[PDB]
């Protein structure tokens, strides 16, 4: 099958160097023209780049021209972006698309998995995680919700399971926003109020980045 | 550069019914030698984009039937004659008359469903995070539609707008319903200065607002 694997992404500072690779299997590599896209966190798509099948022509987006390069390796079917001086405003999930032109061909046709770059002096913090257990006077109904509050962590990097993923139909995950600086995001699970606190809820946060994993057990108040 | 315009979001739609997403540029895309060179991307939630349509018309292998392109110089459309829960997504036109290429802003396409009230749960700080000298007030608003919704909290019935965040979730993949947490977010010495939390969901569903309270006592 046709396969395009990103990879070299990562947290860097600004300012700095870093290359990108995309290797290719499955079509003949050297025939296709290449591209870079890019797309910053929730936001659209962006062209990044582009060199042609023989590496005889190469354009660049504005944003990047004098500071990317692409190039592109034939014999081992990989491409290249070589990005310095890196920026805040680079920082994104990049792919690396397929394009051939001949007469009634289909650019664009395939895109890869994406590496994602994130450009920033924030330094790697593992999260604090808060249970979110109903208070004393509330009222117990058919179902109970139960949550974790997940805080103060960087990069945007963070999973959050209930009871080792055996909870996951009626589970609740909130994306992360910014507060401080830092990343903020909660996970709420919903079961029977007959199973709960009867029998143990817990939530897993795993934070890669940090070599973090914090178990939270959800007690009655 | 040419500019692509989209609409943010498209009207959302029941599975089985047809839909069109247009765009438009600022510049002619239909080209002397009678090509027309807009393409059409899908982006599903999590995935990578993929190709639709290609010069304006034409499409792109293992593409169902069900998608078509057209359009004018500068107008175009993409139609799904009858919409797959699998055709939810973000649709991207992109131009490829010129150098730079450039894309559309994106029209999200979400599903249509029947209203439906949030389940509203108020939890107080976890005396863990008093000990950090914080205190966040956390409210989920589960299981609702449509996605637009309005939280007001209330500190011991006065109400209180600084210290508010809210996040909401995509179109549930499962029900289609969307769900967001409100977290109020004080110092221990503010929260502990104060007896009444109170979060207040207004829904189009009712006109009056789903009411869930806390005394620390």
């Known amino acids: 099958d046709v396969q395009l694997v990103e990879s070299g992404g990562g947290l860097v500072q600004p300012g700095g160097s870093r290359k990108l690779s995309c290797s290719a299997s499955?079509?003949?590599?050297?025939?296709?023209?290449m591209h870079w896209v890019r797309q910053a966190p929730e936001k659209g798509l962006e062209w990044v780049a582009y060199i042609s099948s023989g590496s005889g022509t190469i354009y660049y987006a504005d944003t990047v021209k004098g500071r990317f390069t692409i190039s592109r390796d034939d014999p081992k079917n990989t491409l290249f972006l070589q990005m310095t001086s890196l920026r805040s405003e680079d920082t994104a999930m990049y792919y690396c698309?397929?394009?051939?032109?001949?007469?009634?061909?289909?650019?664009?046709?395939?895109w890869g998995q994406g590496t994602t770059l994130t450009v920033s002096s924030a330094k790697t913090t593992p999260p604090s995680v808060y249970p979110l257990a109903p208070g004393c006077g509330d009222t117990t109904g058919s179902s109970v919700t139960l949550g974790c509050l997940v805080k103060g962590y960087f990069p945007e990097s963070v999973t959050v399971t209930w009871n080792s993923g055996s909870l996951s139909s009626s589970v609740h995950t909130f994306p992360a926003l910014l507060q401080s600086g830092l990343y903020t995001m909660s996970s709420s699970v919903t079961v029977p109020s007959s199973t709960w606190p009867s029998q143990t809820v817990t939530c897993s946060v795993a934070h890669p980045a940090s070599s973090t994993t914090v178990d939270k057990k959800l007690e009655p108040s | 550069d040419i500019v692509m315009t989209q609409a943010t979001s498209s009207v959302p739609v029941t599975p089985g019914e047809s839909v069109s997403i247009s765009c438009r540029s600022s510049?002619?895309?239909?080209?002397?030698?009678?090509?027309?060179?807009l393409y059409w991307f899908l982006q599903r939630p999590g995935q990578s984009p993929q190709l639709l349509i290609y010069?304006?018309?034409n499409l792109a292998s293992g593409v169902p039937d069900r998608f078509s392109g057209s359009g004018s110089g500068t107008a175009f459309t993409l139609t799904i004659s009858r919409l797959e829960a699998e055709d939810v997504g973000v649709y991207y036109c992109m131009q490829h008359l010129e150098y730079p290429l450039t894309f559309g802003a994106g029209t999200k396409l979400e599903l249509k469903r029947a209203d439906a009230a949030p389940t509203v749960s108020i939890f107080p700080p976890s005396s863990e995070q008093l000990t950090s000298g914080g205190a966040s007030v956390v409210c989920f608003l589960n299981n609702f539609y449509p996605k637009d919704i309005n939280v007001k909290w209330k500190i011991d019935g006065s109400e209180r707008q600084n210290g508010v965040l809210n996040s909401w979730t995509d179109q549930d993949s499962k029900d289609s319903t969307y769900s967001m947490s409100s977290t109020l977010t004080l110092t221990k010495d503010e929260y502990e200065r104060h007896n009444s939390y109170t979060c207040e969901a207004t829904h189009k569903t009712s006109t009056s607002p789903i009411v869930k309270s806390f005394n620390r006592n």
């Open positions: 499955g079509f003949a590599f050297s025939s296709f023209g």
């Open positions: 510049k002619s895309l239909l080209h002397s030698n009678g090509n027309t060179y």
């Open positions: 698309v397929r394009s051939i032109y001949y007469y009634g061909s289909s650019p664009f046709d395939f």
């Open positions: 010069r304006m018309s």
